[PDB]
Amino acid sequence: MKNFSIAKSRRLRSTPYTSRIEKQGVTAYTIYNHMLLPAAFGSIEDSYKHLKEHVQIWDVAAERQVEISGKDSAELVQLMTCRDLSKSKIGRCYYCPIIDENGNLVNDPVVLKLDENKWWISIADSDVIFFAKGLASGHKFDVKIVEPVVDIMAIQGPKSFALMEKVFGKKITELKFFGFDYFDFEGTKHLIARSGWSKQGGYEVYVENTQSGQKLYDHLFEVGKEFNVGPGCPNLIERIESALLSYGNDFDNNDNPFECGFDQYVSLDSDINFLGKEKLKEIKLKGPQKKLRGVKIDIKEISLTGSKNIYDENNNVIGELRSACYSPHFQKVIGIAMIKKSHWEASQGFKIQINDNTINGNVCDLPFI
Amino acid sequence: MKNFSIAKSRRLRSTPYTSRIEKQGVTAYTIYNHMLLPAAFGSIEDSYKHLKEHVQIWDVAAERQVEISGKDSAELVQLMTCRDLSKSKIGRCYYCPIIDENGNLVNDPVVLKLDENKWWISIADSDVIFFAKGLASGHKFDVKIVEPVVDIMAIQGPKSFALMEKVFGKKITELKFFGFDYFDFEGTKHLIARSGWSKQGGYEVYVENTQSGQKLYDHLFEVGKEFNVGPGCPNLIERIESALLSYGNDFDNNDNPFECGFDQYVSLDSDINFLGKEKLKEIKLKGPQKKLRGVKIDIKEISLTGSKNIYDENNNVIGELRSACYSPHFQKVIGIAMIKKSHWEASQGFKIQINDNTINGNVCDLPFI
Ligand code: NA
Ligand code: NA
């Protein structure tokens, strides 16, 4: 077969939005945190153009929460991340790389500080819940760790702001990037952050009252018509062009923050203690020997289902291409590659096998645009 | 809206068998431990008839390993599970439920004791690696925790015994259920366990030397024609008929081993140290307020994608149906349901809404065959 069906089960969890997106034209799924996440609503290029010009509503329920509350919650949260959260404030979001005893990445979540003793970790694709529960028991912390009933719906694109003002009023227009607050929809208060996995702008509604959230979803489609609202999902071309890097895809647990361009979130000269702090000091001293870079390959098509070695002018492996797509902006293929320090340099050339043909490519900086 | 395509990417990992099984008729996939696991090779009823009569070779690489080695490995392994490993032997497998701070199920793996100081945890669908790494950090255990390069290939069905004899000779026929040993294929030694996710008989080859395991895979298809060998995967009908439970489907992290029939595997009155031991002492005295049970329901067809409430005569919720299929053996739908204390009783009637018809069903004991 060219395509394989996804086999549904209780274990591969549906969302509060599933029956709706399946009537609105979802054509492919990925799995993220043991949950269905839409991967396409037809053409990925057309979804990208629509996202950059209009507004979309996304089922991103699979961006699960780990809720950590109780006396040692602030501390357990800070143990897990190399980002300094000592001056953190209620109502703010912070991108906090989670790292292990080796200094290697576990997850790149957004942390929401709801209160001094209550923390939501909005996670990428790995079971941070169990890392937390492991660390809590091992370090003897007094916390409560749950996956709460929270199912995110995103509102993304340049028309997101006008659409959400229409629904929630002028108060939501005051929300700064990566702030959150509580907003009323027909009696129910919903936590809404100004965040989301694009650079086109918008919001994420952290739906706890599921029924009210489903009615809100339906309402956004009804009063969004004048804005050309439509369904969507995180967009492959957008995430590569803007270097919105994802755990499991661009980097994984054999990679450290310094190989992924996360230098500014690794806070080594505080007195806060987090995992692998010592090992990350050594890495920052000797410097990394490999790093995520962009690449361009002058072909009009690619379908990356997995990794692919890239080779030098002698046919020695100089890196690994990890994500890639056709970019209409460049009218060629662009990607994210973990490349050896020998070939880091913006403009450095390389060779890669696409089918049975060597083809040339070149390294570039991230983001692409 | 009926079947949906899966979107492949690096993050949904492929396996050493992917290119082979996509030439042998795989039609559907699930995702298991962030990895492709075949869900169908065409009709589920026909794969089922074939498994029960003949022999199949399965890609089950998604049954990943957590390898824990070093001086504190035995202790860390035991800390994660309720099952008593104090008398454990090299060359044996053990079903070892992993339990958290609430006494609830994290994963239900098989543990393989390779050495006093080297352990493989063969995992269900959750990231046990990070629970282990969390525990190890707190207790400052002297251990190394990695996911090794191990990609299980299974041989299952009544003809598995004879096919493996053909390849490996008499010594494989000596291997007892849940034992493992090392067996020579073309000069390479492979760890092979007598185990796997059917009740139809067979083996799991824990392939570390991938190129040799790929050659072995192709060899099995050649010298297995005598036994009508074919491709396959864990079979939904077979596994419900045999009451083989799965983490995420029948039970999850809100469930404790006393609710799932894991009583024989919980060691409360030994001296072993493990998480939630006290909670499980509490829980076992009070007793389970709900348990897993069999159900049989009078329709010839179902598509379970999620929990489905089952009701008494007067529309009260007595349970939740979690796995279900049409059983060609019963010529009707059977399933596994988590049922309230009030309605446990073997033969209790109930009703379930499936589209435009209310359907009679009743509770029964496990297994079915
Ligand atoms: Na989702
Ligand atoms: Na697999």
Swiss-Prot record, chains A, B:
Sorted UniProt keywords: Methyltransferase, Transferase
Activity profile over pH: Optimum pH is 7.0-8.0.
InterPro entries on file: GCST_C, GCV_T_N, GcvT/YgfZ/DmdA, GcvT/YgfZ_C, TrmE/GcvT_dom1
GO MF term set: methyltransferase activity
Catalytic activity: S,S-dimethyl-beta-propiothetin + (6S)-5,6,7,8-tetrahydrofolate = 3-(methylsulfanyl)propanoate + (6S)-5-methyl-5,6,7,8-tetrahydrofolate + H(+)
Gene Ontology biological-process entries: methylation
Top-rank taxon, per record: Bacteria
Broadest EC class assigned to this enzyme: transferase
The protein's Enzyme Commission number: 2.1.1.269
Residue numbers binding (6S)-5,6,7,8-tetrahydrofolate: S122, E204, Y206
Activity modulation: Non-competitively inhibited by MMPA, weakly inhibited by substrate analogs dimethylsulfoniobutanoate and dimethylsulfoniopentanoate. It is used as an intracellular osmolyte.
A Pfam cross-reference name: GCV_T_C
Known function: Major contributor to the demethylation of dimethylsulfoniopropionate (DMSP). Demethylates DMSP to methyl-mercaptopropionate (MMPA).
The protein's assembly and partners: Homodimer.
Family (UniProt): Belongs to the GcvT family. DmdA subfamily.
Misc: DMSP is used as an intracellular osmolyte, predator deterrent and antioxidant.
The protein's name: Dimethylsulfoniopropionate demethylase DmdA
